[PDB]
Amino acid sequence: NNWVIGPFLRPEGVNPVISPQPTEFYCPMRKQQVKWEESDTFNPAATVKDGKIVVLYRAEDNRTSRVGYAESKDGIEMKRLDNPVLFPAEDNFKDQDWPGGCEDPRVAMTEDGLYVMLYTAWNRKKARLAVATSRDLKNWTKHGLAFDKAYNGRFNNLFCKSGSILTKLKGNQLVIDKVNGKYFMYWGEHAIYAATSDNLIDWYPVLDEKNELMKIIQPRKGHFDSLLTECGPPAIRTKHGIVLVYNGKNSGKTGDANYPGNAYCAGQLLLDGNDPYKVLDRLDKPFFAPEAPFEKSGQYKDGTVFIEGLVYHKKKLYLYYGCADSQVAVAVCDDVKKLKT
Ligand SMILES: [Cl-]
Ligand SMILES: [Cl-]
Of the bound ligands, which one is closest to the alpha carbon of residue 332? Answer: 1
Ligand nearest to the CA of 11: 1
Amino acid at 205: P
SS3 of 155-223: the string is CCCCCCCCEEEEEEEECCEEEECCECCEEEEEECCCCEEEEEECCCCCCEECECCCCCECCCECCCCCC
- State in Å: Cα 216 to ligand 2 middle: 7
Query: Cα(57)–Cα(185) distance, rounded to whole angstroms?
Result: 21
- Where is the chain broken, named by the residue before each break, C–N > 2.5 Å? 62
| 184 CA → ligand 2 middle, Å | 20
- Burial bucket for residue 172 (CB in 10 Å: 0-12, 13-18, 19+): exposed
Angle subtended at Cα 281 by Cα 309 and Cα 204, rounded to the nearest 5 degrees = 60
CA of 282 to the centre of ligand 2 (A): 9
**Nearest ligand to the CA atom of 295:** 1
Compute the distance from residue 330 Cα to the ligand 1 centre, in Å. Answer: 10
Measured distance CA(247)–CA(225) in Å, rounded: 7
Q: Report whether 238 contacts 231 (CB < 8 A).
A: no
Distance (angstroms) between ligand 1 centre and the Cα of 109 equals 28
Report yes or no: 290 and 302 within 8 Å, Cβ to Cβ. Answer: yes
Rounded distance from Cα 260 to ligand 1 centre (Å): 18
Specify whether the CB–CB gap between 253 and 226 falls below 8 A. Answer: no
- Measured from the Cβ of residue 93, the count of other Cβ atoms closer than 10 Å reads 18
CA dihedral 50, 56, 61, 65 (to 10 degrees): 130
Expressed in angstroms and rounded, the spacing between residue 254 Cα and the centre of ligand 1 is: 27
Query: Cβ neighbours of residue 24 under 8 Å, at least 6 residues apart?
Result: 33, 34, 35, 36, 82
Q: How many angstroms separate the alpha carbon of residue 86 from the centre of ligand 1?
A: 32
What spacing in Å lies between the alpha carbon of 218 and ligand 2's midpoint? 4
For residue 16, say if its preceding peptide bond is cis, omega within 30 degrees of 0.
yes
* Residue 260 burial class via C-beta count within 10 angstroms: exposed 0-12, middle 13-18, buried 19 and up: buried
Query: Which of helix, strand or coil describes residue 290?
Result: coil
For residues 36 and 66, what is the distance between their CA atoms, to the nearest angstrom?
7
How far apart are alpha carbons 264 and 284 in whole angstroms? 14
Nearest-Å Rg of the Cα atoms of the chain is 18
For strand 193-197 and strand 115-122, is the pairing parallel, antiparallel, or unpaired?
unpaired
| Cβ atoms within 10 Å of 216's Cβ, excluding its own | 19
Burial of 21 (0-12, 13-18, 19+ CB in 10 A): middle
Q: Return d(Cα 196, Cα 165) in angstroms, integer.
A: 9
Tell me how far the alpha carbon of residue 9 lies from the centroid of ligand 1, in angstroms.
4
CB atoms within 10 A of CB 25: 18
Of 254, 178, 192, 195, which Cα lies nearest the Cα of 223?
254
Cα–Cα dist 197/212, whole Å:
18
Tell me whether strands 235-238 and 163-170 are parallel, antiparallel or unpaired: parallel
Is the Cβ–Cβ distance between 271 and 296 less than 8 Å?
no
The whole-angstrom distance between residue 13's C-alpha and the CA centroid of its chain comes to 24
Q: Say how far apart CA 47 and CA 232 lie, in whole Å.
A: 14
- Ligand 1 centre to CA of 80 (Å) is 25
User: What is the Cα 29 distance to its own chain's centre?
Assistant: 25
Q: Could you give the strand order of the β-sheet that contains 327-333, starting from the edge strand earlier in sequence?
A: 305-313, 316-323, 327-333
- Distance between CA atoms of 264 and 184, rounded to whole angstroms? 25
Q: Which one, of 116, 63, 67, lies nearest residue 87 by Cα?
A: 67
| Ligand number with the minimum distance to the CA of 290 | 1
List, in order, residues 6 or more apart from 248 with CB less than 8 Å away.
219, 223, 224, 225, 226, 227, 228, 229, 230, 264, 265, 266, 267, 286
Which residues in 266-298 are b (16+ Cβ under 10 Å) and which e? bbbbbbebeebeebeebbeebbbbbebebbbee
The experimental method behind these coordinates is X-ray
Name the H helices within the chain. Answer: 94-97, 150-153
* 110: amino acid identity, one letter: T
C-alpha 337 to ligand 1 mean position (Å): 20
User: CA–CA separation, 219 vs 267, rounded Å?
Assistant: 12
Closest Cα partner for 224 from 191, 192, 257, 193?
257
**Distance from the first to the final alpha carbon of the chain:** 18
Domains of the chain: 1-341 (2.115.10.20)
User: Considering every ligand atom, which ligand is closest to the CA of 190?
Assistant: 2
Residue 237 and residue 310 in contact, taking contact as beta carbons nearer than 8 Å: no
Residue 100 makes CB contacts below 8 A (sequence gap 6+) with 63, 64, 65, 88, 121, 122, 123, 124, 127
